[PDB]
Amino acid sequence: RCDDWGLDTMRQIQVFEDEPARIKCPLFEHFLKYNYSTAHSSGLTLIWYWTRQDRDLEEPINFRLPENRISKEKDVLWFRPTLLQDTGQYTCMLRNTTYCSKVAFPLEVVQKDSCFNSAMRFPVHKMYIEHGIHKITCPNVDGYFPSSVKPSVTWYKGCTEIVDFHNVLPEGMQLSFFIPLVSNNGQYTCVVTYPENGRLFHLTRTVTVKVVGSPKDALPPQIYSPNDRVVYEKVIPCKVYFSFIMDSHNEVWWTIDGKKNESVSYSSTEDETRTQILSPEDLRRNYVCHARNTKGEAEQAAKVK
Amino acid sequence: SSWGLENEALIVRCPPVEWRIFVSRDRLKFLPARVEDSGIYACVIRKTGYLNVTIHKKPPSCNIPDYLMYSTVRGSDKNFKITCPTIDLYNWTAPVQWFKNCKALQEPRFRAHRSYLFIDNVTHDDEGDYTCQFTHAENGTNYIVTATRSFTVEEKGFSMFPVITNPPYNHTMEPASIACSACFGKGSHFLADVLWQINKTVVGNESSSNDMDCLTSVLRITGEYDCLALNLHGMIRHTIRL
Amino acid sequence: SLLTQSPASLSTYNDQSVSFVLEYVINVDDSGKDQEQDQVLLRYYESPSPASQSGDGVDGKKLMVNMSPIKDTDIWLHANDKDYSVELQRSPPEQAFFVLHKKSSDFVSFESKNLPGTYIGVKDNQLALVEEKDESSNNIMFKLSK
Ligand SMILES: *[C@@H]1O[C@H](CO)[C@@H](O)[C@H](O)[C@H]1NC(C)=O
Numbered sequence: 001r002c003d004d005w006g007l008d009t010m011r012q013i014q015v016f017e018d019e020p021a022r023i024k025c026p027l028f029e030h031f032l033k034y035n036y037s038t039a040h041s042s043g044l045t046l047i048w049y050w051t052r053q054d055r056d057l058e059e060p061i062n063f064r065l066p067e068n069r070i071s072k073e074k075d076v077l078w079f080r081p082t083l084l085q086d087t088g089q090y091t092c093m094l095r096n097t098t099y100c101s102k103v104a105f106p107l108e109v110v111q112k113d114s115c116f117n118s119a120m121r122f123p124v125h126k127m128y129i130e131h132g133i134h135k136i137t138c139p140n141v142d143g144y145f146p147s148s149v150k151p152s153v154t155w156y157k158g159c160t161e162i163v164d165f166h167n168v169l170p171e172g173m174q175l176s177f178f179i180p181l182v183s184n185n186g187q188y189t190c191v192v193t194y195p196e197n198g199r200l201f202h203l204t205r206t207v208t209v210k211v212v213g214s215p216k217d218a219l220p221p222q223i224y225s226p227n228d229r230v231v232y233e234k235v236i237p238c239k240v241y242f243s244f245i246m247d248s249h250n251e252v253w254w255t256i257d258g259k260k261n262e263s264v265s266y267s268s269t270e271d272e273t274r275t276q277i278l279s280p281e282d283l284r285r286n287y288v289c290h291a292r293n294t295k296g297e298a299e300q301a302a303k304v305k
Numbered sequence: 306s307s308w309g310l311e312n313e314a315l316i317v318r319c320p321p322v323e324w325r326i327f328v329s330r331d332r333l334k335f336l337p338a339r340v341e342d343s344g345i346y347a348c349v350i351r352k353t354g355y356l357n358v359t360i361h362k363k364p365p366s367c368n369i370p371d372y373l374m375y376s377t378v379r380g381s382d383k384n385f386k387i388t389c390p391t392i393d394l395y396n397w398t399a400p401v402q403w404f405k406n407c408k409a410l411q412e413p414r415f416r417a418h419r420s421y422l423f424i425d426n427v428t429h430d431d432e433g434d435y436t437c438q439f440t441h442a443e444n445g446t447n448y449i450v451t452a453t454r455s456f457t458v459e460e461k462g463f464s465m466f467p468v469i470t471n472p473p474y475n476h477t478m479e480p481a482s483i484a485c486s487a488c489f490g491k492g493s494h495f496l497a498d499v500l501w502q503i504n505k506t507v508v509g510n511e512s513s514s515n516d517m518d519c520l521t522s523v524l525r526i527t528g529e530y531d532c533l534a535l536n537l538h539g540m541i542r543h544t545i546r547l
Numbered sequence: 548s549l550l551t552q553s554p555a556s557l558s559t560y561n562d563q564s565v566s567f568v569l570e571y572v573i574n575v576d577d578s579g580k581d582q583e584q585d586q587v588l589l590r591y592y593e594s595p596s597p598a599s600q601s602g603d604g605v606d607g608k609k610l611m612v613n614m615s616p617i618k619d620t621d622i623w624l625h626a627n628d629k630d631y632s633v634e635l636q637r638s639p640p641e642q643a644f645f646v647l648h649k650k651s652s653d654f655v656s657f658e659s660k661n662l663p664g665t666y667i668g669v670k671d672n673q674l675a676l677v678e679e680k681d682e683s684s685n686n687i688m689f690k691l692s693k
Pocket residue numbers: 396397398442443444445
C-alpha cells in the first residue's frame with residue numbers, strides 16, 4: 001500500500017461543463033521536495049484514480065474514452081472536454097517498486113447559463129478610477145493551444161456582447177478601459193474559441209470588474225469627529241475617513257492617557273469610513289482618538305468638560 | 306461661422322432643403338474646398354438660415370493660429386480624452402490620426418478610439434495644440450479632413466459626498482450660536498455649499514485635523530433648525546432642535 | 548424650497564457646446580476657440596431620490612436641477628412626456644426638473660424627473676430623452692464649467 005498525504009484542499013476546483021480543463025497534481029509543490037522533471041528522471045510514474053461525486057468507491061481513471069476525452073500529460077490531467085459526470089474526488093499517486101505517495105483533491109464541474117450565470121466563483125479585479133488606461137486579460141488561457149493557433153475571443157458585459165464602448169475596447173485576449181469609471185463596473189466574460197485536431201473548443205472566464213479609489217487621491221486618515229466644535233458636557237465616536245489603498249491596513253483606536261464598538265462603511269470606490277464608539281475622575285481624563293494608514297497618522301482629542 | 310483648409314473636404318450643418326460644391330439631404334459639401342467658394346450660403350426649409358464659411362491656405366508654420374482651432378479642451382489627470390471636432394459629419398473610418406504641435410503621436414501612450422484620443426500617464430507636459438486628421442470617402446474618392454483644438458491639463462483633486470462634522474446627527478443644544486460644518490474632499494469644486502434652513506426654507510475661526518476642503522456656516526440668532534451640505538454628489542441634512 | 552443658483556456653461560462628453568439661439572432652440576456643436584459660449588442658470592433643489600451610496604447610516608439625497616438661459620431667466624429646459632424631446636418652454640412643472648447624477652470627476656447626467664429612467668442626451672445636434680446604456684453612455688454625460 002501507499003502513504004497518504006490526505007486531501008490537498010477542501011476548496012473545489014471549479015471548471016465549466018463541456019469545456020477543456022487541465023488540472024494539476026498538487027503533489028509536487030505542496031508536499032514534496034521533488035519537481036515533476038526530476039521525478040520523471042528518477043524512473044517512476046504518475047497514475048490517477050478518482051471517486052465520482054455520487055459513488056463511494058474508487059475507480060481507475062479511464063484513458064480509453066473516445067477522442068481521448070481524459071488524458072494525462074506530465075503532472076497534469078487533461079479533459080477535452082469536461083463532462084458533468086466528472087465531478088468527484090481525484091487522486092494522483094507517484095510510484096515505483098520502491099516508493100509511493102498520493103494526494104486527493106475535489107473537482108466540481110459547473111453548469112453555466114446563456115447569460116453565464118453559474119455557481120462559479122469569479123475573481124474580483126479592482127481598477128483605479130480615472131487613472132490612466134487599464135487593461136484586463138482573459139484569465140487562465142495559457143497552455144490550452146500553441147502560439148501558431150490564433151483563437152477567437154469575444155467579450156461580454158453581463159449578457160450582452162461587447163463590440164466596443166465609448167470608453168471600452170476589446171483587443172483579442174485583452175479588454176481596455178480608457179478612463180475607468182464606476183459606470184464600467186460589472187461582470188465581464190471572455191469566451192475563447194480555438195480548434196484542435198479537428199475539434200472546436202471553448203473556454204469561458206468571468207471577471208468581476210470593480211473600480212476603486214486611485215492612489216493620486218490617497219490621503220492620510222482624516223478624522224471628522226471628534227473636533228473642537230463638539231464638547232462632551234457631563235459616549236464619544238471616532239469617525240475616520242480612509243482613502244482606498246490597495247494593500248493597506250487601516251487602523252483606528254482610542255487612548256485614555258495611553259491605553260484601551262467598531263463599524264465600517266464603504267464608498268462606491270471602496271474608500272472606508274470607520275467609526276469606533278467608546279464609553280467621577282473619568283471627566284478629568286484626556287480622551288484621544290488615533291488613526292493610521294499607509295500615508296500617515298492622525299490624532300484628535302475629544303473635549304470632555 | 307464655419308471654416309476649413311483648401312484642398313480638404315468641408316461639410317456644414319445649417320439650423321425640402323435647397324442651396325465642386327454638392328448638397329446631400331440638408332448638408333452642403335465642398336469636395337474639395339477651394340478658397341474661392343468662401344462666402345455666405347443660404348439654406349431654406351419648406352424657415353431659413355445663413356452661415357459665413359471661410360476657406361484658408363494651409364498655415365505656413367506648424368503652429369496654427371487661434372482662428373482655425375476649435376473649443377479648448379480643459380482636461381485633467383482624470384479626463385485625458387480629446388475629441389476630434391466635426392468628424393461625424395463626414396463618412397470616415399478608423400483610424401483617425403493625431404498630431405501634437407504638428408508632430409505625429411505614435412505610441413501606446415497615445416491611444417486612438419472612435420473619435421477620441423486618450424493620453425495615458427497624462428502630465429502637464431502634454432499641454433498644447435492637437436490636430437486630428439481623418440479621411441472622408443465619397444464615390445471612390447478619398448478627401449482628407451483635419452481639425453485642431455488646444456488642450457490643457459490641470460491637476461484635479463477629488464470630491465466626495467458631503468460629510469457634516471458638526472453638529473452631530475441626533476443632537477440638541479440649550480444670544481445663541483450653532484455652527485454647521487462639512488467637508489467635500491480635497492481639490493477644486495464646481496459647487497460646494499453649507500447653509501442653514503429654518504422650517505425647511507433658507508434663512509433669508511479654527512479648524513479640525515483635516516486636510517480636506519471644509520466649509521462652515523454659523524447661524525446666530527441674536528435673541529426645526531437644519532444644517533445642509535451639498536455638492537453635485539448630493540445633499541445631506543442634520544437637524545438640530547432647542 | 549430653492550437651495551442655490553449658479554450660472555454655468557454646458558459641454559458634451561464629445562467636447563461640443565450646447566447653445567440657445569435667438570428666434571429659442573437648442574444646439575449642440577463644436578465652436579471656435581475663445582468664442583464666448585452660452586451660459587445657463589442652474590437652480591438646485593433636494594430631489595426625492597436617495598443619494599445612491601451616501602454611505603451606511605447617512606440619509607443622503609441627490610440634487611434636482613432646473614435650467615434657464617442667462618439671457619432670459621423665465622425659460623426652462625422642459626422634457627416632453629410622450630414626444631421624448633428637450634425643449635425650452637415659458638413656477639415650473641415637474642417636466643422641467645432633472646435629477647442630477649455625478650458620473651465622473653468632470654461629467655454629470657440629468658435624469659428626467661417627469662419620466663424616470665430617461666436622461667437628457669444629445670441626438671443629431673439636439674437634446675432628446677434617451678436611456679443610459681454602457682455602449683453609448685457618452686450620450687448623457689455633460690460637463691458644467693464656470
Ligand atoms: C463612405 O460611403 C461611400 C459611398 O459614398 C462608400 O463607398 C465608402 O466605403 C464609405 N467610406 C469608407 C471609407 O468605407
